[PDB]
Amino acid sequence: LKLIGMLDSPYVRRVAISLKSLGLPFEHHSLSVFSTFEQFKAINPVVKAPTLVCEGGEVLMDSSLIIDYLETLAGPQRSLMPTALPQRLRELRLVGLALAACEKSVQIVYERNLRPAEKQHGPWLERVGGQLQAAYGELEQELQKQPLPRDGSLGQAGISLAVAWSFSQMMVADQFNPGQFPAVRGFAEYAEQLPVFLATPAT
């Protein structure tokens, strides 16, 4: 198995940590969809990261679909997802919120770095920034109501939430202030000291 993409992308990182958490060995090819376009295009012409090349050479994209494939390959015993409806529903909500925070953080990065200042649109940044704040706000309320376990093991919500938070702090820190979203920050900083996160640095 081969994971194509840079770990500074939260989508690539959540897959990398999911792979390790599921016990599936793999090769990591650190390629950028922007600075090594041709090299990435040679593997996946759609040029989307993460891209997973399976044992037979099949190419997959989209972090959630890649993880669905990995979950299938690993078997139910290793699932990072609860199966009971209530519990799974909650997990899906947390992952959804975390992925929304990822999407909005990335949209801000793209708006500011992929086009000249003159073409940057204030109303767009305002909207996206508000959505980013809402996402972490919802996550904060969920965690304040029901804290995540800190037992050395991780579920998809924990992985995705930690990866998302650390990414936002690295790339769009100007959207945050010290002490903000204490529950989310607290869990992310706890997760970042777990062996699997330490072995998969974003940078």
Ligand X SMILES: N[C@@H](CCC(=O)N[C@@H](CS)C(=O)NCC(=O)O)C(=O)O
Which of 64, 79, 133, 169 forms a contact with ligand X (CB under 6 A)? 64
| Nearest distance, CB of residue 95 and ligand X, angstroms | 11
Pick between residue 168 and residue 194 the one whose CB is nearest to its own copies: 168
CB 73 within 8 A of CB 24: yes
CA angle 101, 68, 64 (to 5 degrees): 20
DSSP structure string for 76-105: GGG-SS--SHHHHHHHHHHHHHHHHHHHHH
**Is there binding between residue 189 and its own copies (CB under 8 A)?**
no
**Is there binding between residue 63 and ligand X (CB under 6 A)?**
yes
CB 172 within 8 A of CB 108: yes
Gyration radius (Cα) of the chain, Å: 17
9 binds, among its own copies, ligand X, none (CB under 5 to 8 A by kind): ligand X
Pick between residue 4 and residue 135 the one whose CB is nearest to its own copies: 135
Pick between residue 157 and residue 194 the one whose CB is nearest to its own copies: 157
Handedness of CA 184, 190, 195, 201 (dihedral sign): positive
Q: Is 9 flagged in the annotation as binding?
A: no
Torsions phi, psi for 144 (to 5 deg):
-65, -35
**Bridge partners, residue 59, by sequence:** 53
**Is there binding between residue 89 and its own copies (CB under 8 A)?**
yes
CB 28 within 8 A of CB 21: no
Which of 48, 90, 93, 112 forms a contact with ligand X (CB under 6 A)? 48
CB 99 within 8 A of CB 164: yes
| Residue indicated by tokens 């072995």 | 199
Which of 1, 22, 43, 73 forms a contact with its own copies (CB under 8 A)? 73
| Residues in the chain, total | 203
Of the candidate spans 3-11, 15-23, 65-73, 184-192, the one that interacts with its own copies by CB under 8 A turns out to be 65-73
**Sites of contact with its own copies (CB under 8 A):** 41, 45-48, 54, 56, 58-62, 64-66, 68-69, 72-73, 83, 85, 88-90, 92-93, 95-97, 99-100, 114-116, 118-121, 123-124, 131, 134-135, 137-138
**Sites of contact with ligand X (CB under 6 A):** 9, 11, 33, 48-50, 62-64, 106
Q: Binding site membership for glutathione: which residues?
A: 48-49, 63, 104, 110, 127, 131
